[PDB]
């Protein structure tokens, strides 16, 4: 048939599009992921770095 006729997309479309609500919820979930990934990567580096400080038997002879 004619290429100007668009097929049926109605079982996935929102009843009201409302562009300032669809963008706001998607950016909440991406922002929460970057929040938790930065706090997780920070404690990971501090676990490896603090293993080079003085051990428990060295501190006992201080």
């Amino acid at each position: 048939k004619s290429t100007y006729r668009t097929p049926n997309f109605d079982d996935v479309l929102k009843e009201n599009n409302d562009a300032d609500k669809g963008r706001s919820y998607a950016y909440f979930m991406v922002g929460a992921m970057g929040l938790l990934s930065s706090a997780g990567a920070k404690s990971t580096v501090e676990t490896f770095i603090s293993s080079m400080t003085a051990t428990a038997d060295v501190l006992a002879m201080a």
């Binding site: 300032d20 963008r23 950016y27 922002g31 929040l35 938790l36 930065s38 706090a39 920070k42 404690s43």
Partner: protein, 54 residues
Amino acid sequence: SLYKTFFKRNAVFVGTIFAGAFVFQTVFDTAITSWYENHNKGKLWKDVKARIAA
């Protein structure tokens, strides 16, 4: 609008996920430690020392 005050300006979208994660560390560690010690009350050394004072 609350997209453009929270997630548009990506001089602090990198920033707020880097500063909200700083205060996140102390509130999270205080809440779990308080729950973990209350679940195990009567078994810790501080609960033992309070009545091995004799």
